[PDB]
Structure 1
């Protein structure tokens, strides 16, 4: 016999409340287990109020750094390495979230971007981007193309010119700098200059929207189809043959992507530390657990070694594991917060037609320093 058994799950995106409800109705069925499903809006202020107590439970679903990156420096239920024995999970999954020597991050949704291809009229990747032009001239020779996507989209131009030569820091064998910026370099310039000229060197107008620029590839099927926050799941599909491949390098190496794992859990495991972990292990990350979300509201898959055997059938994880195989974890870097304002005035203005990167770059070199 339990007591109260009440929990508050904060989620908001599209669905999930319907699936989580089924799990609660079954729990309370015993005689005292009801869960609440609400969307976050004022929790930002209630957090510091509920952190000490407030009510009782508290579990919100957020990105890796959003929760695991923030909670790590606040008050997260740092679990101990015990279940890892009977669980026999993978070290790469744990090492990915190893801060100091505790567990302040629980991933329960691996989502990432990738490139789609075919085995009929879609030539495979030659090697690097330099070859991309050869596929277009060849495709058009008949009645197709090898490039169709947005241009002024976020999290697209940044990662491209980010891992092209330089911008924030230099990566050497997987090592980032601290007080050493590399924005004032030929690499960072050659990149922004390439992605920018592509616009003025095309229609010098820029009349392609998100739904338009995206409709290009979605209009039929070209050598360029990337999935994102729009339609990851659709019950089922049929295109004869379809697969996923990793992005091609550029001037040495491709953009700088990362894994999209959702960090969910209790804060400091204050409210029921036992039931909290047990409820998450025996009512969230299990055959019956995910059975609700994986069926009710699908989107991705977990990183279970056992389930991975059958989960491999799905491309969702197959695409993430590709880049995640070698390494892909979004860092913290708080300086990025301020850069968000510079990246706009730098790109946006430069895209106006009466602005050059030399200004946003050179002028920034003086501001960034002093």
Structure 2
């Protein structure tokens, strides 16, 4: 039997359907008292919401895979048991297991495959228009945010650089302090004068008002964008961009969304938390998340269900996940520093605060900063 009390943290608009998932959980485990709330600052900030006070945080919490190495090294999350590991590995696609594995051990329960795509109004742009960045932006406005390094760091990967080495595990393996890195910096700078590129902190609102024809966004907004655009909804994988005069695919990050178990829980409550984490990331639960938000399951069987297989967003995400189209977010303990330093590097190139004469120096300093 499983008993205990657990607090579950999810993102704000997910609460209603996680209550449904928890109702399903309680059909099987009637003696576990679950309290579902939003987290203080979201899954993108689990690192710091938990780290502020691990013992006060939720017992099960949503967290993106890049945060896992830091949290594992800090002792905030424990390795999954052999049986829990086997279930994750057998039930989900390979990249989901890679996403949660740190130094050979799994530290979270994966449930969604995240890659950004182009979402666009098909009354304003065609499927062919969205194939290239310059062609798209010559025909309509793309609204985006150069202060968000998750949007634009992957241009460095398109340029041929590595982030923490071949598989994201090498402390000194970021080699963006190179001519290839400078090509990406130059691309950011070029976008400031591209009249088809609108800087905004709320790209979704610009799409909704009609001031943008396209945005880059991820599947956490799939159902939201389908509702906004209605019959004008369309989606595509990322386009090509020109780097050093060559057309190359513009990458996104590939992220794996997970739930992790807070290592503070003990006794019954710990067993209840692990049971909940497993359940809310199971196939049925992944499909409920899909039904409500449009996020893409990592479960092998769910990905091949007729409804997922026929969803154009799922198809675009599957394309994005292929080699060359995205890179799995690394999970090095340094990642919080990486993100903090990457955003002003990129935005400085975009705004001109970093001029071309300083690209090499700034990239050298960046690599030193993130490689400790």
Asked if TM exceeds 0.5, the reply is yes
| 5+ long unaligned stretches in structure 2 | 41-48
**Match of residue 113 from structure 2:** 110
- Of 306, 317, 339, 1:320 maps to 317
Kept in 1: contact 2:153–2:346 (CA 8 A): no
Alpha-carbon RMSD? 4.6
Asked if structure 1 preserves the Cα contact closer than 8 Å seen for 2:118 and 2:217, the reply is yes
Partner of 2:43: none
Q: Which residue of 1 aligns with 2:217?
A: 227
Tell me the distance in 2 between the aligned counterparts of 1:148 and 1:63.
26
Match of 1:191 in 2: 184
Pairing 1:239–2:231 present: yes
Shift of 1:36: 1.0
- Corresponding residue number in structure 1 for 2:128: 124
1:110 touches 1:262 (CA, 8 Å); kept in 2? yes
Distance (whole Å) between structure 2 residues aligned to residue 105 and residue 279 of structure 1: 12
CA contact (8 A) 1:150 1:208 kept: yes
Residues 110, 261 of structure 1: 8 Å contact kept: yes
Residue 143 of structure 2 corresponds to: 149
Alpha-carbon distance in 2 for matches of 1:85, 1:25:
20
Q: What residue in structure 2 maps to residue 14 of structure 1?
A: 13
The structure-2 alpha-carbon separation of the partners of 1:367 and 1:217, relative to structure 1 and needing over 3 Å to count, comes to closer
SS in 1 for 2:153: helix
Confirm or deny that 1:305 pairs with 2:297: no
Name the structure where strand makes up a greater proportion of residues: 2
**Deviations along 1:18-76, whole A, 9 cap, x unmatched?**
642673498389863321123444643431x479xxxxx81111111224652365242
Where does the alignment leave 5 or more consecutive residues of structure 1 unmatched?
Answer: 52-56, 138-144
Describe the shift of the 1:87–1:161 C-alpha distance in structure 2 as closer, same or farther (beyond 3 A): closer
Counterpart CA distance in 2 for 1:282 and 1:100 is 25
Tell me the distance in 2 between the aligned counterparts of 1:275 and 1:80. Answer: 17
Instruction: Answer whether contact 2:89 2:97 (CA < 8 A) is retained.
Output: no
- 1:285 aligned partner: 282
Aligned residues: 346
Task: Normalising by structure 2, report the TM-score.
Answer: 0.69
